[PDB]
């Protein structure tokens, strides 16, 4: 099953909801209300984390970022997890940003449930340790 059909399946999830007239208290997103983590998939490999944060900031303030990278070479696998400060920004981003094109590639944005953080057992990098323990965020 091609990834584009996954992008289309989330969009049809939304259109179908509109046709049936479902209320927001029982929307599909309400199953993911507890979490503030969203999966982004299909990204171009040229994008770095400043790019991801630069664009997905339209809907709120990003708390943490996990663009998963190859262990040996360090290059990007293409998918990362973002945590928003508001949980409602996840609704806005899954609706609005699913299936948009960046450098000619469509991306899928979906809610992630019970996201489990990476263990700091590895001492491979330092900046990743800073990102895990502290993470990106405005400083007064």
């Amino acid at each position: 099953m091609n990834p584009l059909t996954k992008v289309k399946l989330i969009n049809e999830l939304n259109e179908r909801e509109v046709q049936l007239g479902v209320a927001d208290k029982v929307s599909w997103h309400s199953e993911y209300k507890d979490s503030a983590w969203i999966f982004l998939g299909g990204l171009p490999y040229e994008l770095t984390e400043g790019d991801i944060i630069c664009v997905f900031s339209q809907y709120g303030e990003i708390v943490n970022i996990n663009l998963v990278r190859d262990k040996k070479t360090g290059k990007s696998k293409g998918f990362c997890f973002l945590c928003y400060e508001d949980q409602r920004s996840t609704i806005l981003a899954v609706d609005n940003f699913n299936g948009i094109k960046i450098k000619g590639r469509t991306i899928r944005v979906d809610h992630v449930s019970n996201y489990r953080a990476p263990k700091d057992s590895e001492e491979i990098d330092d900046v990743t340790r800073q990102l895990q323990e502290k993470g990106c965020g405005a400083r007064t």
């Binding site: 049936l20 007239g21 479902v22 209320a23 208290k25 029982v26």
Partner: protein, 237 residues
């Protein structure tokens, strides 16, 4: 579709109580499509396995849930109606204490402002007519026939077709000779309903008229059958 198929197959192995007890409280869920899915699963499970497994505490859950789901529909399809019929036919004589509640609900929703709500109420009478015969409660169904007779003057053809369908079911279940209002009162009421050009009305009325024509022809004069006979030539268009 895959989800409802798989849950029915699980219920074959595990048992109807174990599956139905996990999803019965979502007949009160406030997403329409969800309730619709849950209704389908219960419908097929009690169609395949019967209701010998369902104890008394879960049948109140079930009867209350299908009444809630029936009162809270918008999408205008047969799924809640089929589900209601399958469940109460599976329950059989165990549903007899719940018939006052059901009759009161249906009797009340027959006159609210929405045409769709009144239509659905007459559909529910047509599905549960047989259950009241098995529950031996012919007095109540007799009363219903008397009530639906006053709803004949409807101006919305969808509601009138369902009133007629409900009447058709009561005539079948109780019989022409014990029917109230008597067939003498019902047939001359029906002959101007023949004029209605809407197909649902014509269909349900012609069946009713044609069935009286053989099993009950002494309830009308020969001049009446002649003029009603003349009227039938417009039904051929």
């Amino acid at each position: 579709r895959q989800l409802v198929d798989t849950t029915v197959e699980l219920a074959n192995k595990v048992g109807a109580a174990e599956i139905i007890s996990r999803i019965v409280d979502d007949l009160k869920d406030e997403a329409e499509q969800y309730r619709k899915m849950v209704m389908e699963t219960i419908e097929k499970i009690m169609g395949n396995l019967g209701a010998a497994d369902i104890d008394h505490k879960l049948e109140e859950q079930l009867i209350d849930g299908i009444l809630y789901a029936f009162q809270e529909q918008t999408t205008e399809d047969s799924v809640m109606l089929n589900g209601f019929g399958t469940v109460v036919n599976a329950l059989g004589k165990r549903v007899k204490p719940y018939l006052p509640q059901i009759c009161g609900t249906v009797l009340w929703r027959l006159n609210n402002k929405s045409a769709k709500v009144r239509q659905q109420a007459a559909d529910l009478i047509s599905r549960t007519a047989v259950v009241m015969k098995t529950c031996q409660e012919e007095k109540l169904m007799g009363h219903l026939g008397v009530v639906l007779y006053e709803y004949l003057g409807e101006e919305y053809p969808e509601v009138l077709g369902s009133i007629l369908g409900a009447l058709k079911a009561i005539v079948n279940v109780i019989g022409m000779h014990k029917m109230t209002p008597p067939i003498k009162d019902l047939l001359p009421r029906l002959t101007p309903i023949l004029k209605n050009r809407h197909e649902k009305v014509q269909e349900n009325c012609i069946d009713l008229v044609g069935r009286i024509a053989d099993r009950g022809a002494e309830y009308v004069s020969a001049r009446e059958w002649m003029r009603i006979c003349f009227e039938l030539l417009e039904l051929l268009k």
